[PDB]
Amino acid sequence: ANSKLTSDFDNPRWIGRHKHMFNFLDVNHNGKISLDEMVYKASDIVINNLGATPEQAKRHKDAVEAFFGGAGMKYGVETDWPAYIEGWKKLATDELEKYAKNEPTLIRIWGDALFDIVDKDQNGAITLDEWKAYTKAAGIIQSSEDCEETFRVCDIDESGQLDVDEMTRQHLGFWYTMDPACEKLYGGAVP
């Protein structure tokens, strides 16, 4: 492993980051969300907004399923906030253990599936316009300014593209650890 990455689950900013995403995913404010809703949203984006082929959409669905499944979410089950954050601690712990052992993480698997769809050239890297297209379809980022901040925070290659290796590292830090190097990865869109 190129980094020594550790959890910080009692940091109110960690908890808060995931509460933000919980509230953003709970579009109708039910106080709970299901795996059914998560995989619906994921496939809706890639198939109906981003042009995914059937095989590409299925690969992506599988990776989203396993990601949220790692946080304890299940088909036909409604997950409330207390269960969600409990599951998220397990997910992060498991991911960081795989990382420390140089084994593929669920976030890498998902990234590789998503980048196959989003990168016009299928070479594992995306342009700013492609990042804007994905994030604004998903709604996780709403403004171009915030999408631009992502390219400031990450190490960009000489052609001005964000590669999956770099985005995986940044996401490990941003979602699992509170690495201060990854602050503002989504600009002002996600605290």
UniProtKB/Swiss-Prot annotation:
Coiled-coil residue spans: none
Keywords linked to the UniProt accession: Calcium, Disulfide bond, Luminescence, Metal-binding, Photoprotein, Repeat
Matches recorded under InterPro entries: EF-hand-dom_pair (IPR011992), EF_Hand_1_Ca_BS (IPR018247), EF_hand_dom (IPR002048)
Organism of derivation: Aequorea victoria
SMART domains according to UniProt: EFh (SM00054)
Documented effect of changing residue 154 to S: 41% activity loss
Keyword Secreted (UniProt): no
Limits of the EF-hand domain: 13-48, 49-103, 112-141, 142-177
Gene Ontology molecular-function annotations: calcium ion binding
CDD domains for this protein: EFh
Phenotype for residue 124 to R: 51% activity loss
Residues at the site labelled Required for bioluminescence: 191
Protein name per Swiss-Prot or TrEMBL: Aequorin-2
GO biological process: bioluminescence
Family: Belongs to the aequorin family.
Effect of residue 147 to S: 33% activity loss
Variant or mutagenesis effect after changing residue 147 to R: 52% activity loss
Entry binding sites for Ca(2+) 1: 26, 28, 30, 32, 37
